[PDB]
Amino acid sequence: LNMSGIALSRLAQERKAWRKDHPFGFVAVPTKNPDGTMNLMNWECAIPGKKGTPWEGGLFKLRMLFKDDYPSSPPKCKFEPPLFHPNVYPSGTVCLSILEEDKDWRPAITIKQILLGIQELLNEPNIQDPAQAEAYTIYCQNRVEYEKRVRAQAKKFAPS
């Protein structure tokens, strides 16, 4: 077997587990190849904002990019479009400890965990590693304003 084999076998297993059971409102489906076949290395996901939070109502689109060395390596997660959030790079790339090899990544981590992890990050930013100057500054300087912009954002991404 090659690196990808390992990755693919795991991803396939991830898929099954997801379809079998997953948090309500969440979405996680592999993309299609130009030929209609599933591309397990690229997943289009959606994270709903948590009720009771300023994120409530929004459905945030995220892309999950897996490398050949997965699960040795974590997937690259990016919001599309990029979100206003202290831990999200302007590119849309999420900054989360579990998504960094040298940090908290563990091969055992599931898509489900990732997703839920991102969801919690949304409402609970990590002041320790700012990824977006703007959002970070506001977050610290004026939460009301921060909350105000977050809500607008949520509205902007509300389904219809």
Side-chain angles (χ1 to χ4, degrees):
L1 64 79
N2 48 12
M3 287 218 298
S4 27
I6 291 171
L8 292 169
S9 99
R10 164 68 177 268
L11 284 169
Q13 178 192 295
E14 282 288 344
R15 204 192 70 109
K16 321 270 163 328
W18 183 266
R19 302 167 61 72
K20 174 178 191 182
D21 169 63
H22 67 274
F24 187 78
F26 290 62
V27 184
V29 298
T31 57
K32 291 292 194 176
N33 295 308
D35 55 303
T37 63
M38 281 184 344
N39 182 358
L40 282 174
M41 312 290 288
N42 185 358
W43 289 52
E44 277 166 13
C45 324
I47 293 186
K50 269 198 286 56
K51 293 167 189 166
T53 79
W55 298 90
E56 176 182 20
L59 195 66
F60 318 90
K61 289 192 166 187
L62 172 129
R63 186 169 308 275
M64 218 175 284
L65 300 175
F66 302 86
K67 310 304 180 191
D68 290 276
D69 62 348
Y70 167 81
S72 176
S73 71
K76 169 171 65 175
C77 293
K78 59 180 322 173
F79 283 104
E80 291 184 341
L83 296 195
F84 166 86
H85 187 284
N87 308 114
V88 170
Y89 289 100
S91 57
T93 292
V94 191
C95 188
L96 189 62
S97 72
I98 63 148
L99 302 173
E100 275 188 59
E101 215 170 79
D102 271 275
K103 287 181 189 169
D104 298 68
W105 171 256
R106 286 181 182 192
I109 291 146
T110 71
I111 274 60
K112 189 164 149 320
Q113 294 171 266
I114 297 173
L115 291 191
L116 297 174
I118 294 172
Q119 181 196 51
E120 67 178 292
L121 171 74
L122 284 184
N123 187 245
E124 199 63 60
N126 183 352
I127 295 311
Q128 283 307 291
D129 58 298
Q132 193 196 125
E134 180 180 50
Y136 177 76
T137 301
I138 301 177
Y139 181 81
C140 305
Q141 282 188 337
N142 186 343
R143 217 145 296 165
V144 172
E145 176 69 24
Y146 177 76
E147 188 150 325
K148 165 184 152 195
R149 316 184 41 144
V150 161
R151 284 178 195 283
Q153 175 161 250
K155 294 150 190 166
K156 187 186 322 281
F157 295 116
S160 277

